[PDB]
Structure formats: structure tokens, C-alpha cells
């Protein structure tokens, strides 16, 4: 089998991506937010406490007739960012562009921190990390993609992220008309249960390509590129007036600049991020100081090859026994 769809910024940003996702019988469609940084697929629900849902579609198992609750089992998350959402666990009939998973475990947000709230275009998360990573107990739970994988034709998805457009997410097959080129195949580590990985370097704009080994983790479900302080340097030093703010929490430049592009290696390959993505716009409205789009990954403990890398690439997530990455320009 396979599966096929569609995946859109959430606003001008590209800040994140949503993906419809049909839940249940009759299906409920909830917009989701695919993060292969996380394992969890958790969903705004009928039991959500009611001050922390602000205009989100909200699951309501109570109205599938495929929904089963999953006793005794429970759910509680913490993200990067700070973020957070638990509640409990149900089993039900999950499809994405065509791909049928039942028995999926679908974990139903009684509580949510505010910034889930605050944003009214993301319905939950779907998790594409490796499923040691699941937070349901005491029995842990299999993401979507581990639930699809052998009944894929190839045990693999792909993401293909739009710069302030559209983009796909397709399960079990490659479109090899989605990318320019030949797709660099990359060793992955999943003893963190992340898609972790060794960029083999970097550039900036024209500039001369340092080999250097930079481990990160290929992360949709993150905004911007984290990369060591001194990489990130070397990039900011390219655009007149950029700094470091510790007021506003990383890099920020003037919005009259023109951004250098970044580029990354991939193998004996080069993944080129235009400047253009590497701008995240005024850091209040109407600011002449835009908030940079690469930055320090210093504190957070790992790289995170976010949105902004990912979306200048064609990326294959490889679930073969031995799982890889690819990555192709496009």
C-alpha cells in the first residue's frame, strides 16, 4: 500500500506545517502537525478541558464506532520548546492520503499548555520518530508509520516541505519526480529514537565549504536550523548588523538585509538553504529586526535539522531494518 498528502504552512512563516489526517468511523479530519521529532500522535478532543481549546476540530471518540478506549493507559509529553500536552489513550481507525492503519493508537489531550491553545491551525501531532520514544503507559504504543511499515511497498516515507507553499508527505514509495538529481543516502543512529545523523559540513553563501562532522536529528516538528555556536556564527558574521540577542532569544538582523544562503553536506553532497528561508520575519509587528532562521543549537544539547533545512530538500525517512536518511535537492 501507500499513501499520498498534502502538507501546508500554517501561516507566512512556513512556522509549521499541517496535514489532514482521518480519524475514526465516520472519519473526523484533524489537521496535524507530522514531527519527526516525536512519537506521539495526541489529538484536541472531546476531552480537552474547555478553557484550553480556542477554535481547534477536536476528535470526539465517543461518535466512531471504531474507537476503543485502551485501558488504563495514559499519556504526557514535553517538547523542546517548552510545551507540553497529556491525557488518555484510544485505539481507532487512523488514514492519511490513503493509507489505512486500524488499531492505531490515538492519545486524547485532556490537558494542553497554552501555546497548543494559542495556535487555533494545529489540531495535534503525529509522531514519525522511532516509537521507543512513545510516551503512553504502562504499554508503550507503535507510531503510524510502525503500525504501516509492513504493509507498505517499500518501508519508507518522504517529506517534501514548501517554502511558503505546499508540499507532500508520501508513505511506502519515492516519487522520483519530486526531486533534481540523485537522492545521497546518509547512516542513521536511532539509539536517541530520533532520525539522527552526520552532516558532513557546511557553507555560507559562495563561500568555501568546511568539512566538518555535525551530528543532528532531522526534525519536521521543529521551525528553524540549531546548529553549533560557531557554525552559526560564521553565518551571521556574513550579514551587516546581525547579532546575537539575548533579549529576543537568538540571532536577529536588520529586515533591509538580503541573506546569504547556507549549505549543508549530505555525503559527498551539498543541500543549498537560499538566504531567503533563513528569515523569519519582524520579532514584533512592526519592526524593522527580523529573527534569523538559523541558530544556536547551544543548550539545547543536540543540532536539529528543522523546517528551514528540510524544506530545501527532498528527504527520505528509510525504516528498512537498518534505517538510513536520504536526501536530494529539488
Do not use: M
Amino acid at each position: 500500500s501507500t499513501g499520498s498528502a498534502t502538507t501546508t504552512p500554517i501561516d507566512s512563516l512556513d512556522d509549521a506545517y499541517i496535514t489532514p489526517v482521518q480519524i475514526g468511523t465516520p472519519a473526523q479530519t484533524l489537521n496535524l502537525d507530522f514531527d519527526t521529532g516525536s512519537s506521539d500522535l495526541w489529538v484536541f478532543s472531546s476531552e480537552t478541558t474547555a478553557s484550553e481549546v480556542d477554535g481547534q476540530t477536536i476528535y470526539t471518540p465517543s461518535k466512531s464506532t471504531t474507537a476503543k478506549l485502551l485501558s488504563g493507559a495514559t499519556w504526557s509529553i514535553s517538547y523542546g520548546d517548552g510545551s507540553s500536552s497529556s491525557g488518555d489513550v484510544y485505539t481507532d481507525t487512523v488514514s492519511v492520503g490513503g493509507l489505512t492503519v486500524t488499531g492505531q493508537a490515538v492519545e486524547s489531550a485532556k490537558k494542553v499548555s497554552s501555546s497548543f491553545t494559542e495556535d487555533s491551525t494545529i489540531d495535534g501531532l503525529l509522531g514519525l520518530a522511532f516509537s521507543t520514544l512513545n510516551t503512553v503507559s504502562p504499554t508503550q504504543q507503535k507510531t503510524f508509520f510502525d503500525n504501516a511499515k509492513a504493509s507498505l511497498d517499500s518501508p519508507v516515507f518522504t517529506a517534501d516541505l514548501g517554502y511558503h507553499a505546499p508540499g507532500t508527505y508520501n508513505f511506502g514509495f519515492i516519487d522520483t519526480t519530486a526531486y533534481t538529481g540523485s537522492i545521497t543516502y546518509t547512516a542513521v543512529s536511532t539509539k536517541q529514537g530520533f532520525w539522527e545523523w552526520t552532516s558532513t559540513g557546511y557553507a555560507v553563501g559562495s563561500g568555501t565549504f568546511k568539512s566538518t562532522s555535525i551530528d543532528g536529528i532531522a526534525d519536521t516538528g521543529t521551525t528553524l536550523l540549531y546548529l553549533p555556536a560557531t557554525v552559526v556564527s560564521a553565518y551571521w558574521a556574513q550579514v551587516s548588523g546581525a547579532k546575537s540577542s539575548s533579549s529576543v532569544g537568538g540571532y536577529v538582523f536588520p529586515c533591509s538585509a538580503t541573506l546569504p544562503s547556507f549549505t549543508f553536506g549530505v555525503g559527498s553532497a551539498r543541500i543549498v538553504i537560499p538566504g531567503d528561508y533563513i528569515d523569519f520575519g519582524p520579532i514584533s509587528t512592526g519592526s524593522s529586526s527580523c529573527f534569523g532562521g538559523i541558530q544556536s543549537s547551544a543548550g539545547i544539547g543536540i543540532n536539529i535539522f528543522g523546517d528551514v533545512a528540510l524544506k530545501a530538500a527532498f528527504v527520505v525517512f528509510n525504516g528498512a531494518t537498518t534505517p538510513t536518511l536520504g536526501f536530494a535537492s529539488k
